[PDB]
Amino acid sequence: ARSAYSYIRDAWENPGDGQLAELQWQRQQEWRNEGAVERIERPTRLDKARSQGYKAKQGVIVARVSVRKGSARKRRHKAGRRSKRQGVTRITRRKDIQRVAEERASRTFPNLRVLNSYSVGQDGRQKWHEVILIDPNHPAIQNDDDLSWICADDQADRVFRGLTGAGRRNRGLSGKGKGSEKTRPSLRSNGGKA
Amino acid sequence: TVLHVQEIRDMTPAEREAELDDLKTELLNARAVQAAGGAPENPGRIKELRKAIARIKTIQGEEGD
């Protein structure tokens, strides 16, 4: 039969309807008063967290991060620029908000490593994402066959190098075929053309 | 030279510290004579006095005192 989890998931398909709607209307009031990075005891979306690698276990951490909505916060040019480069208003960053959130969280927990993240809504001026981080130095995790991979030395600061799921999709690596000529194996090896 | 490693290892933790202080003193006075321009020097000693002190401290380390 349906897992209880399927009900959490099912509710988040429409965060604007039913109970979830009223719940969000309430929570955001408190969230808007919390910091930029708030560690939380439990994922707001269990099914999603668990689906992304979460586990009720020592060394597993979750944190809700708030990030502003919109385009790049850019300063107008202070020297000569051809029209093409005189823009300010329509310029958007190449890193999506979710990735920005994942980075702010990781910096907050210097010792932890980002495992994944998911969205938990937004109001008119900010978006909230919950990030799952892992303690690569805790034996509880070092002895976990489903997570100890994140303990390896080459997984250090993985979020800052775009090795995150959100980091990889944002890098245009989803497609294995047509369209990923200038993304795989890396954006940089392809002369930054994607 | 005049003071070898075996002789140092055969001493007791207390004989080393004693031998140590003695050397330091010999050295201090050697330097005092040097400071007074005292020519009755023997460049080799004032130099060996440093190594002797090094060897002893080294052994006190290996032995645990």
Binding site: - | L28, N29, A32, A35, A36, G37
Partner: protein, 81 residues
């Protein structure tokens, strides 16, 4: 670990302090305080130190003018080394 006394600062002025005011002058470690200079001097020469004046010399070392008590004789202490 560093030692307090380096060597007797023997010079004309140094002698004068010894013959005339019962003072011994030493080149000491600049990390050393007057009190530490006083002790060291007592423990190394078996004497009683009454006063200690210091100076951080332009030679990069500290100089100490240690005055002995009437019971002690600077000339005799200095003379045995």
């Amino acid at each position: 670990s560093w030692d307090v006394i380096k060597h007797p600062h023997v010079t004309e002025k140094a002698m004068n302090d010894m013959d005339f005011q019962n003072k011994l002058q030493f080149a000491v470690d600049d990390r050393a305080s007057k009190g530490e200079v006083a002790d060291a001097v007592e423990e190394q020469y078996d004497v009683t130190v009454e006063q200690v004046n210091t100076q951080n010399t332009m030679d990069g070392e500290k100089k100490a003018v240690v005055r002995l008590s009437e019971d002690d004789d600077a000339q005799e202490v200095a003379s045995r080394i």
